[PDB]
Structures are given as structure tokens and as C-alpha cells.
Structure 1
Amino acid sequence: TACRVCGGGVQEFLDLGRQPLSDRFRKPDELDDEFTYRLAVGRCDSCEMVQLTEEVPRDLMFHEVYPYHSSGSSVMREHFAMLARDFLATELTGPDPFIVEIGCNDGIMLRTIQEAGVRHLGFEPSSGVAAKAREKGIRVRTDFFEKATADDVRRTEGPANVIYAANTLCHIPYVQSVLEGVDALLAPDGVFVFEDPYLGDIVAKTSFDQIYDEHFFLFSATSVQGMAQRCGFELVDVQRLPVHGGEVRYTLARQGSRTPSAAVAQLLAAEREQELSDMATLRAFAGNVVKIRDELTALLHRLRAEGRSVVGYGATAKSATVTNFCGIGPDLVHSVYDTTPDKQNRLTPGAHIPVRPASAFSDPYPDYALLFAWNHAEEIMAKEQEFHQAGGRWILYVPEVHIR
């Protein structure tokens, strides 16, 4: 398997087996046939980039009915509005600024930019969520960002002061093409800023559900630094973020144009000291993944034997990994509750557990809810205080299997 960043050899360290598309929710009457692929994760020998060993073709994952709506979380809405105001105050000052967002989804970030009157363009190849962004008055192209479409925007719109990507750069195995795109499109003094699930958090929390078809890369400061350097850029800042289970926001600039913050060296040294990306570390993680599987299925089967009812909360893409790697179906978790209309009245991928609206999670409550949207715990449990007050309990599997 050749590394997508540098062409080095990739060594597997975790095999999560056959998996379905994580974001395909079937109607109950649909033929039980899904696309499957082998989900496994390796580390490049040369650049230390951790990445999947099989690419799902982009058109199978991202298209007209892609179901994830970013704006469905109040924490994430505030998180991106804050980010946008931060760019408006720093990188987008001065005359006729231009920001391009890769993966704008329903416009969660760009709405703030558009309300500031700033020129912008979102790339969103998933046309149904693109339309939700356009309804907010955001300018969006229903295209993948890559070298050619970047060139096209550079031709018609001129250079961008900021190119931003949240939870999208790690989805893209053709990252070199994206980088060439960024090189064509970014202002000489601009920044390419992206934030994605962080390898250090996944390792520390054993959050293996962060690994599924759409998550190609599990970035670290170490791998991102190498990737930037190889493509003509430089990692010039890093910021840790609590969202989505733990992320890092990386800022890249053209090489030598800005001086790296002390934060970059500090995080690099912490990764090296902790041996984050050493194969033995990544294998110990893989062994902990198996332990969490075994304890989670033991618990779920015991709850069944003791006549306790169990549901899931949040029809996350992440959960496809949990239910298929663990073999959890509707006989152990009867329904999954979710606020996304396009996921409701459908079945989860591979495991086929029915998804019902969150409004249906109500008195009489089940005994236990398996929290798939664990990265949204605070937001979710704040809205579901009555469940817990009535004696309903949460089952979490990050960072360990526990009930509370």
C-alpha cells in the first residue's frame, strides 16, 4: 500500500474488517445489499502519516443525499461562528478579502462570513447540504476542491487570503491534489487552516469509532509538518480543540513567510516524547480497541440477559464502525435516536438498527442509552436531563466501557 502523501510504504496496525458506507441510511424495505470495503489503518514508514489502506471512491460517500448536517449541534454552530469572527478580525481585514471553505456543508461557518459582507466561496460536492447553505445566501460550488477546480476559482475570483477546511481535509486521500490547489489559489501571504480529529486524542481515548470510510487520514503535528514541508508549505501554528472527540487546528503558510509559533515545536516535542506515532504505540492502541469491543459486547449481552432495554443515541457515521466491528444489531440495541430528518425512518448501515427521531426518546424511557454521539455528550445530556432523572443511564465506550 503506497502512502498518499509521500509514496512511502504503509504498515497496517489495525484491521476493523468489512465495513459498509458509514453515511448510507437505507429505508427498511430496501434490498439488504450494501457496498462494503475493508477498513484497516496503517502508518507510512517515511512521513509517519497514519491513513486507511483502502480508499472508498469519493462519489460513493459524497453526493446528493449525503446526510450529515453540521448545523445540528449548537456547540458546533458557536464553534464555527467564533472561528469566522476570528478570521474576520485577523486574516480577512483590509480591502476585498476572500475566504474559500472546503467542505462548507450547510453553511455553518460561512454564514458568519456572508453576514459580514465578505467575498467567499464554499466547495460542497454534496448537493443537498450545499442547497441548505445557498438558502442562507452563501456562495457555494457543488464541486470537490482539487487542483483543477482550485485553478478555476483562481482564474475567476483571484487569490484567497484564507482557505479553510474543517473535518474535510482528512476525508481526502488526494491530498496532494488539494495541496496543489491550495498553492494555485492561496495569496502569497495567506493561510490554509484545517482542523480534523487528532491522532493523539484517538490514541489516548481509544476512540476507534473515529476510523471509518470518510476518515482517510488521522493527522498528527508530526505528519502534518512533513506533509506541508513536502508540498512547499510550513506548519506555522497548532491549536488543540475539544470538538469531535479532540482535534488539532493546523495553520499552514507558504514556507518561510511566517515564523512558527512556539506551540508547533511544543506539540511536536510532546508527540516525540510520548512516542505517539511509533508502531508499538499504534499497535498497543489496536489491542485496546479489541478490549473495548470485547467489554462492550459482554456488557450489552449481559444487559439483555438481565431484561434491561437498550437503545442508542445519535446515528453517527462513527457508529457504523462500532456496530459492524462489534456485531451489535437491533437484538441488542433496539433503536437509535437522532435529530436528522434524512436519517430518521431508516436503518443504520450494516447493522440495520432502526433510527427514530430524538423526539421519540421520551417517557417511558429505556433503561440504557448507548451514546454514539459521545463527542456531543454535554449538549445531549443537557437536553435529556429527564431521561437521567427518571433513572435512565448512559453507556459510553470512550475512553473505556462505563455506565453513568
Structure 2
Amino acid sequence: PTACRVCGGGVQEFLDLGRQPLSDRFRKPDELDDEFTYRLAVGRCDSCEMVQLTEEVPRDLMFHEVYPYHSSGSSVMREHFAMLARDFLATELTGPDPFIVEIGCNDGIMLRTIQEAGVRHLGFEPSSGVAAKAREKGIRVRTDFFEKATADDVRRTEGPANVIYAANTLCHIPYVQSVLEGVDALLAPDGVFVFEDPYLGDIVAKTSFDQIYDEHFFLFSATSVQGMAQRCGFELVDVQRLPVHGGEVRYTLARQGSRTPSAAVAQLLAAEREQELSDMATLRAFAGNVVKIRDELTALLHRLRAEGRSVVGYGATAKSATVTNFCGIGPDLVHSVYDTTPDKQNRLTPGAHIPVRPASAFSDPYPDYALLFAWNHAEEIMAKEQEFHQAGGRWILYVPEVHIR
């Protein structure tokens, strides 16, 4: 019976995805078939409604020198972050000597636009290989985790930040109270801490269980974020839904009572209450839907094999580790996975050990089917792979249901 990392309440489990490997560890084929594994299960705190995993993976096992995800590998995301940076430069970063700190800046996808605007900034990026990619672009980066002590150190030497921003990173951090204390130490009194992460309501609506894996400790909602803010001295003052990464919300927190919440905050809270989003029964219904997607996906993949059809995967997502390991999908059913990330290529996916090959290798003669693990990138990918579909190749999707098109 684990304690909520937000409030210390009791977390009741509703979904057990079993034994899983580290999602972003890609092994060379000659490596020992030994892997770290942990139990992936999700529950909901009884007191603040925060949905969260019940076993933490230690941060240094996930985030370190060879972390492989490079944010800038998607054109949609590069545009998405450039626009956000422009929005901040026009609103929160006006005035003299503004300062923005990004938590989890990766390869500098967002902070490049800030640096090109001449605005003082600091990225925190504890994964040193992508940190170096950002530094190559002229971005100032500390290769450290953001937490209370490193935030204090930055406030000491650099002064208060007008904006603290985190995308697809807050939800990865079980030590969220320490981060919030770091934000309290570092943020200007009239500043904002803005984060965007996969949204519980989209996960439940689309049965997108592959959004649950080691790096995604929290599945935030407006309800839980509002409670988390309030308990830590802040206030949820804006929310915006975003289509990226399968559906997100961007949450804006301010010091309590410094700004009046937008109507959007109340409207999203009322819709979550109306739709019973975080009620344990709704969350168990989702868990039941997850098993149905497993069973239909494996039935399909086995029928394809019996029918002599070839099947590959597209995108060696961290997400797909949950899919292949919960569903038991290995190279006998999905022969290769195609991906543009050099440090994932010529390696095997975690747990299931499917070989990953460069996306340039996905070409005539094409396979019959491609299981689309990077389904959040469907539009971008399929635009680049029209020749596959024109040839008669078909995509297998498992969100929001198993279907082929």
C-alpha cells in the first residue's frame, strides 16, 4: 500500500502491467540478456486524486549519459516548441533582463529559440549526451536534475526566473514536492511555472496505456494538479489542451492569489467531475479496456502470421516497451522496428528484443503491415511514408482501438 508522493495519502491500484524493463534501454544484440525489471502498476491517491505508479525506478537508471531520446527528431515538435517559446517571449519574458529556466531541455528543442532571442536562460538536463547537443547550439545547460537544492543554487547565482518551464518532464519526477520547493525558491514572485504532460483524460478516452511506463510516474489531470498546486503554495491559473504526444494539458501555476484563474481552469475541472474521470470505477473500466486492446492486438498479430503476412513496427518509442512486454510481442510477430534515432539503431528493443533498424531501411520492397508505435506522430510519419501506403502497405494502430488502415 504505497504513499502518494504528492500528499502522503493511500494509493489504490487499478492497473497492473506486470514486469517491465527500462523503456529507454536499447541493447546491442551481443549483450547479455539480463535487464533491470520492475513492476509497472498504477493507482490513484485516495486524498488528492493524483494517478501515479506504485513502484519508482531510480532516476539514475533512466536518465544518464546515454539516454537516447532526441526531442528534435520531430518536425511537429520542433514547431510546437518554437511557438511556445515565441509566446513566452511576447508575454512573460518582456521587460528588462528576463530569465527562463527549462526543466528537461533535452537537445535544446525549446531553448534554441530563447537563445536566438538573446534572453538569459538555463536548461536543466541530467542526461549528458543530449545536454551536449543543446550546448552545441549555444544554449546554457546544467547537466543536473532540477530539485530543491539545484534550484537554490541557481537562484543564488542567477537571481529569480520569470518562467520555469517543463515539457514531458514533470510527470517523470516522483520527487515532485522537491521540484515544487525548487520552484518556490527560484521563481519570481510574479512568475509562472508552466508544464505540459500527457493528460489523464486523453489516456482514458483513447485507452492509450502505452503512455504508462517507467518514465511516466504521474498521469496528471486538472483535478490532481490543482490539488498539488494548492498543497504546495501555488495555484492552477490556466490550462490548455494540446494534441501532441497523444493528448496533453499545459498547466500554468502561479503563487497563490497572485493571478486570477482563467475560466478554462474551472471549465476543465467541471468536465472532469462531470465525466467522473478520476473515480476509481472509471479508472478500472480503462484497465478493462487495456486488457481488451492486448487481447485483440495479439489475436491480430498471430492471425497475420498464420496468413503469411509480414509485420514490422514503426518508431522505437519508449511507449512501445509497455506494449511489447505487456502483450508478449517479440521478433516472431513483428520482425524489426524502424526508427530515425541513431543511438537506437542496430540495437534491440527492451524486454522483447526486436531489432531496430534506420527508418531509411523502410523502403521497397515493403512489408505488408507496419505496427505504428509512434502513433502520436501519425501525421508526420505517414506524410513521409506515402510510398509505403501507395504500394499497399498498411498501418496497424492500437489507439484508440486495434484497427488497420
TM-score (normalised: structure 1):
1.00
Distance 1:396 1:384 in 2: 15
Q: Deviations over 1:224-264 (max 9, x none)?
A: 00000000000000000000000000000000000000000
Report how far residue 350 of structure 1 moved.
Answer: 0.1
Distance 1:231 1:282 in 2: 26
Distance 1:63 1:290 in 2: 33
Q: Deviations over 1:255-282 (max 9, x none)?
A: 0000000000000000000000000000
- Counterpart for residue 125 of structure 1: 126
Report how far residue 172 of structure 1 moved.
Answer: 0.1
Q: Deviations over 1:354-379 (max 9, x none)?
A: 00000000000000000000000000
Distance 2:22 2:99 in 1: 35
Distance 1:66 1:338 in 2: 15
RMSD: 0.1
Q: Deviations over 1:72-119 (max 9, x none)?
A: 000000000000000000000000000000000000000000000000
Report how far residue 387 of structure 1 moved.
Answer: 0.1
Distance 2:170 2:212 in 1: 14
Distance 1:94 1:184 in 2: 21
Distance 1:372 1:70 in 2: 16
Q: Deviations over 1:42-99 (max 9, x none)?
A: 0000000000000000000000000000000000000000000000000000000000
Q: Deviations over 1:295-346 (max 9, x none)?
A: 0000000000000000000000000000000000000000000000000000
- Counterpart for residue 104 of structure 1: 105
Report how far residue 200 of structure 1 moved.
Answer: 0.1
Report how far residue 399 of structure 1 moved.
Answer: 0.1
Distance 2:115 2:260 in 1: 30
Distance 2:326 2:208 in 1: 13
Distance 2:207 2:32 in 1: 34
Q: Secondary structure, in 3 states, of the residue corresponding to 2:67? A: coil
Q: Deviations over 1:153-208 (max 9, x none)?
A: 00000000000000000000000000000000000000000000000000000000
Distance 2:359 2:375 in 1: 15
Distance 2:138 2:35 in 1: 36
- Counterpart for residue 248 of structure 2: 247
Residue 55 (1) aligns with residue 56 (2):
yes
Distance 1:47 1:37 in 2: 25
- Counterpart for residue 348 of structure 2: 347
Q: Deviations over 1:12-71 (max 9, x none)?
A: 000000000000000000000000000000000000000000000000000000000000
- Counterpart for residue 159 of structure 1: 160
Q: Secondary structure, in 3 states, of the residue corresponding to 1:28? A: coil
- Counterpart for residue 294 of structure 2: 293
Structure-to-structure mapping, 1:4-403, within 5 angstroms? 4-403=5-404
Distance 1:270 1:317 in 2: 30
Report how far residue 211 of structure 1 moved.
Answer: 0.1
Distance 1:252 1:288 in 2: 33
Q: Secondary structure, in 3 states, of the residue corresponding to 1:386? A: helix
Distance 1:369 1:384 in 2: 11
Distance 1:395 1:232 in 2: 46
Q: Secondary structure, in 3 states, of the residue corresponding to 1:294? A: helix
Report how far residue 123 of structure 1 moved.
Answer: 0.1
Q: Secondary structure, in 3 states, of the residue corresponding to 2:227? A: helix
Q: Deviations over 1:117-157 (max 9, x none)?
A: 00000000000000000000000000000000000000000
Report how far residue 386 of structure 1 moved.
Answer: 0.1
Q: Secondary structure, in 3 states, of the residue corresponding to 1:32? A: coil
Q: Secondary structure, in 3 states, of the residue corresponding to 2:356? A: strand
Identity of aligned residues (%): 100
Q: Secondary structure, in 3 states, of the residue corresponding to 2:66? A: coil
Distance 1:142 1:42 in 2: 32
Distance 2:360 2:313 in 1: 14
Distance 1:239 1:75 in 2: 18
Structure 1 spans left out of the alignment, 5+ residues = none
Report how far residue 8 of structure 1 moved.
Answer: 0.1
Distance 1:365 1:359 in 2: 12
Distance 2:267 2:17 in 1: 33
Distance 1:260 1:192 in 2: 14
